[PDB]
Ligand binder design. Structure first.
Ligand SMILES: Cc1cc2nc3c(=O)[nH]c(=O)nc-3n(C[C@H](O)[C@H](O)[C@H](O)COP(=O)(O)OP(=O)(O)OC[C@H]3O[C@@H](n4cnc5c(N)ncnc54)[C@H](O)[C@@H]3O)c2cc1C
Ligand SMILES: NC(=O)c1ccc[n+]([C@@H]2O[C@H](COP(=O)([O-])OP(=O)(O)OC[C@H]3O[C@@H](n4cnc5c(N)ncnc54)[C@H](OP(=O)(O)O)[C@@H]3O)[C@@H](O)[C@H]2O)c1
Ligand SMILES: Cc1cc2nc3c(=O)[nH]c(=O)nc-3n(C[C@H](O)[C@H](O)[C@H](O)COP(=O)(O)O)c2cc1C
Ligand SMILES: Cc1cc2nc3c(=O)[nH]c(=O)nc-3n(C[C@H](O)[C@H](O)[C@H](O)COP(=O)(O)O)c2cc1C
Length: 645
């Protein structure tokens, strides 16, 4: 039941496809592979999330295995795949001499340890005597080539397995892993979009004496929390960034400054409409999915309505995979479209030209090819097994648990920019962030008609479960933590929203410092310096707060702002400011300071790291390489932590 070799064998599976995915990217591609493997060779494949099984009996797997692994933190596996990571990192020599596998690693060359998880995993597997079929795939999210990278690796591996297994191909045809059934009435056991099944009327939320909602809150059961306060942090007529405050008192959730919050979204109504239209799906359709074997896991709560699935369960928005096109050939509206489609699925570049570059969503791509002709022969099952599952988006909590124990602050910059290719098309927006903004405007009685809100969301939720200004949520414990000793110096680097953690960090230090003031015994606070950065004065996050914080922390605090887009001057980054203050920074580091790097970036991570290596290199008068080794050490020990996304 958790005994991998046993599960495979008992269910007579010909192939095993494992995946270690944090955000689900690895999982979805794993599914794409599995589906195609069934479509072309009718193999009875097993899709498993590496986290749900015990790989002790891995060397007893009579079938070939495909491993899809992502890289996080250092060159390490996704949280909750460490068990797997350890079985591997501990498997002795010859411990997996029967294992035959191929692996596709998902990473991003913008980080040091690019695809290191897959690499580590490939090094230990071969160490235990496992034979590796085909080339080690490496999807580079940094170059935005992940989908094509997969297509490339995919095609070559399938050839290999065709040989290795002596399989006879066949025209690719879809085969549901479920038993689709169309119901007629809606029960209390049927979902209208509720997150986990526990929120279905016919189910009882597990609380305590005082009604406080209990149970563990994670990806398999969020906690619907209300956003009690919300405001705009920017003052730019093009960009927005929202400050959201979540009340967690109605639950036994505890968070530590430095943790992450996962916000479960829903789709923009105007996109839900586009999807439902191009296919010609009736929202009111009630359906149920019945697995065709124990290995198969229903995607979301069922039965449910088509419109609920498309609004709360499927990622109908985002870049269309070329593989989707290939899989859509079976249900082309007409011979015409079927041909155009066929071509695009095969031509890497034409696909990018006709679809990708225009920022299409499935709805758009298809409507583009059909010229409006609906794709009314596409099965909801296919759509369910073929469209990526919606997934929570994470945020660096910007509140202090010591001064907010029950409340959680989130600093999300809204994603919404003009289509670079189509000057008349709608903006390219992000679900969650625009959703958070919608709630923000709403909650504040802002006339959203005037605003630049590009889309809008169902703010009531399923059965009004989202009781105005509420959303499924769950805390994700991290390692980003302030030093134990208050005296230890601290260095915080966070461009843009990357300052979120640091706001909490400072709020923690400021809160703490208060307590000491009502207890006499004062502890001297080590030096705390912050390097922040933003375009101009309109995107200067929590501008008003820092001066107050500074007053309460006195000389223990120091902020260094940099602006990359002020008119008439030269673009300045935090790494630039790091070199300006190299003496201060070097000194602090020689005093055991801790280095914190947070934010999005695409570059900033290595940039800042490189800056420090320079500072160190000059400071201790050693080579760049030595200094690089010293920096790697500070990261291994934990004196240099990074929360870069
Ligand atoms: C550990 C961690 C911490 C984080 N902390 C923060 C934080 O503090 N603050 C913060 O703001 N974010 C943070 N993030 C990022 C955040 O989780 C999301 O990535 C961000 O909010 C985008 O959410 P969304 O719902 O708008 O994205 P999505 O809807 O998934 O959209 C992503 C992007 O793709 C674009 N897009 C949409 N459709 C298409 C298409 N068809 N083709 C191409 N592009 C398309 C969107 O416009 C958008 O820019 C963090 C992430 C992690 C993993
Ligand atoms: N990426 C996504 O884009 C959105 C914006 O996030 P954000 O506010 O952090 O981004 P942002 O506002 O672009 O970044 C904040 C600041 O960092 C600068 N910057 C860009 N590259 C940098 C680098 N390599 N090193 C140091 N600083 C750099 C930016 O200047 P520039 O004007 O040079 O970008 C800006 O001043 C998020 O939703 C995120 O998910
Ligand atoms: C917090 C965070 C840390 C990451 N660290 C690395 C890293 O060290 N190396 C790398 O190659 N990619 C890194 N990535 C990129 C992911 O591996 C990549 O986006 C992958 O597609 C994620 O797949 P998943 O969604 O299946 O987990 C990181 C991503 C995030 C969000
Ligand atoms: C053309 C194209 C198609 C893609 N198709 C998919 C897809 O079907 N499934 C998936 O998980 N990622 C797909 N990706 C990858 C995402 O764009 C990318 O990994 C992004 O970081 C995901 O962010 P998320 O965390 O919001 O999923 C595709 C990328 C491109 C460029």
């Amino acid at each position: 039941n958790r005994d991998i070799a046993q599960v495979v064998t008992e269910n007579n599976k010909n192939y095993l496809v494992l995946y270690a995915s944090q955000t689900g990217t690895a999982e979805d591609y794993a599914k794409k592979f599995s589906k195609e493997l069934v479509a072309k060779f009718n193999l009875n494949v097993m899709c498993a999330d590496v986290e749900n099984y015990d790989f002790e009996s891995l060397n007893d797997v009579p079938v070939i295995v495909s491993i899809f692994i992502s890289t996080y933190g250092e060159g390490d596996f996704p949280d909750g795949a460490v068990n797997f990571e350890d079985f591997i990192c501990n498997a002795e020599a010859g411990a997996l001499s029967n294992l035959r596998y191929n692996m596709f690693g998902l990473g991003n060359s913008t980080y040091e340890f690019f695809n290191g998880a897959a690499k580590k995993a490939e090094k230990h597997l071969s160490a235990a005597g496992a034979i590796r079929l085909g080339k080690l795939g490496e999807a580079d999210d940094g170059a935005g080539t992940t989908d094509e990278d997969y297509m490339a690796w995919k095609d070559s591996i399938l050839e290999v397995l065709k040989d290795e297994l002596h399989l006879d191909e066949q025209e690719a045809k879809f085969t549901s892993q479920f038993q689709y059934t169309v119901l007629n009435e809606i029960t209390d056991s049927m979902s209208l979009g509720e997150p986990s099944a526990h929120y279905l009327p016919s189910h009882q939320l597990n609380r305590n004496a005082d009604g406080i909602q209990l149970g563990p809150f994670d990806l398999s059961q969020p906690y619907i929390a209300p956003i009690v306060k919300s405001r705009e942090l920017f003052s730019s007529n093009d960009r927005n960034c929202i400050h959201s405050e979540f009340d967690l008192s109605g639950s036994n959730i505890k968070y530590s400054t430095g943790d992450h919050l996962a916000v479960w979204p829903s789709n923009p109504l105007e996109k839900v409409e586009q999807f439902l239209s191009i296919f010609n799906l009736d929202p009111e359709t009630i359906f149920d999915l019945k697995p065709l074997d124990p290995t198969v896991k229903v995607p979301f709560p069922t039965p449910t309505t088509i419109g609920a699935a498309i609004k709360h369960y499927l990622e109908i928005t985002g870049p269309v995979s070329r593989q989707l096109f290939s899989s859509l050939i079976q249900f082309a509206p007409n011979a015409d479209v079927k041909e155009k489609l066929t071509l695009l699925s095969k031509d890497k570049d034409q696909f990018a030209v006709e679809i990708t570059s225009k920022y299409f969503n499935i709805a758009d791509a298809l409507k583009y090819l059909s010229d409006g002709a609906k794709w009314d022969t596409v099965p909801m099952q296919f759509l369910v097994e073929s469209v990526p599952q919606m997934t929570p988006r994470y945020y660096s909590i910007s509140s202090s648990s010591l001064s907010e124990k029950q409340t959680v602050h989130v600093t999300s910059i809204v994603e919404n920019f003009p289509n670079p290719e189509l000057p008349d098309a709608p903006p390219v927006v992000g679900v969650t962030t625009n959703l958070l903004r919608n709630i923000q405007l709403a909650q504040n009685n802002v006339n959203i008609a005037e605003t630049n809100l590009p889309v809008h969301y169902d703010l009531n939720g399923p059965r009004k479960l989202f009781a105005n200004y509420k959303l499924p949520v769950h805390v994700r414990r991290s390692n980003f933590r302030l030093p134990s000793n208050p005296s230890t110096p601290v260095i915080m680097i966070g461009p843009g929203t990357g300052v979120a953690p640091f706001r909490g960090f400072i709020r923690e230090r400021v809160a703490f410092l208060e307590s000491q003031k009502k207890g006499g015994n004062n502890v001297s606070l080590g030096k705390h310096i912050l390097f922040y950065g933003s375009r101009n004065t309109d995107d200067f996050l929590y501008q008003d707060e820092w001066p107050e914080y500074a007053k309460k922390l006195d000389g223990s605090f120091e902020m260094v702002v940099a602006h990359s887009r002020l008119p008439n001057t030269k673009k300045v980054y935090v790494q630039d400011k790091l070199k300006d203050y190299e003496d201060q920074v070097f000194e602090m580091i020689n005093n055991g300071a801790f280095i914190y790097v947070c934010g999005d970036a695409k570059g900033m991570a290595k940039g800042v790291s490189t800056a420090l290596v320079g500072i160190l290199s000059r400071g201790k008068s050693i080579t760049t390489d030595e200094a690089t080794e010293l920096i790697k050490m500070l990261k291994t020990s934990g004196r240099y932590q990074e929360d870069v996304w």
